[PDB]
Symmetry: C2
Subunit: 182 residues, 2 copies
């Protein structure tokens, strides 16, 4: 049934208020409905459950605006993205998961299937619409842009040699849209 | 001192890089390095307080020459040449896996994360930012551009696609990273 909803909802609230440290099947099984091998059938791991619950928890906050101006909408989405990544547990949640995935193939697969593939598709989609209105050159690969935008933020988060601030986010978009050469 | 002592440090670092790149990080041990180099563990422990620091320092010096920045006066050509050597190292060498797994472990090991920056990433960044600032000083990059941001939009973009492979890391990807940035992605 759609009972998968109540679970995701519970997991989402937990993740956004305290991270994954105490995210257990037992606890989730109570706060919501029933475990009964269910959670295990739907979600084979703690990471799977975390990823699924996380995706749906930030889905709306991270949705792309479409007011006709790619610059403004990209800035808007990236700023909502950086707020989630730097002001809520979202950043710590994803970096830990990304970290663990480097030596756990199933978790890596789950990360892409329950979170990253969809996020990238959502970004590429908004980018394609701009590319249609001729706001982005016809020969530009939108998937590359995703890595040069959100990817860049992920990078500073994973390897914090430099801070993720609004100036950073704004330069990301401006450098790309206007180019860095004279 | 810093001569016969630095020579010794270099030999050890060379041994570390050789072992690390052929056998992987799990195989790297102080006992193994000491045996292979002929230098006592006592000395090793003094220079590298941990296995993490040992691996990172050896790794940085093993790829240094290969990842050095050409400085021919053509930022586009030099950037493409460096990103391609970088891509080769990260995808066609054990180096890619070695580094990504250290980045992964660093996510839950504060000390390793600190060593990763001090012995590898901070210096890689400075090397890249330096090449970029040079291009800016020569006028090939707008003077109001923050080169540190560019670092994340080039190498950072590669690391990202490498850490989470939803898309492939090939030459087309590499070339697009540079053209998008240098030429911009908006018409005209």
């Amino acid at each position: 049934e759609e009972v998968r909803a109540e679970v995701l909802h519970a997991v989402g609230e937990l993740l956004l208020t305290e991270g994954t440290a105490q995210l257990t099947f037992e606890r989730v099984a109570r706060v919501s409905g029933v475990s009964k091998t269910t959670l295990y059938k739907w979600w084979p791991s703690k990471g799977a459950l975390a990823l699924d619950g996380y995706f749906h928890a930030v889905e709306d906050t991270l949705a792309f605006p479409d007011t006709g101006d790619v610059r403004a909408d990209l800035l808007a989405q990236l700023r909502a993205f950086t707020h989630v990544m730097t002001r809520t547990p979202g950043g710590r949640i994803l970096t830990e998961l990304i970290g663990a995935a480097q030596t756990d193939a199933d978790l890596a697969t789950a990360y892409r299937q329950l979170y990253s593939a969809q996020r990238r598709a959502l970004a590429a989609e908004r980018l394609r619409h701009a590319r249609e209105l001729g706001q982005i050159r016809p020969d530009v690969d939108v998937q590359v842009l995703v890595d040069q935008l959100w990817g860049a933020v992920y990078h500073r988060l994973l390897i914090p040699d430099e801070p993720v601030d609004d100036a950073f986010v704004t330069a990301l978009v401006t450098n790309l849209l206007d180019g860095v050469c004279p």
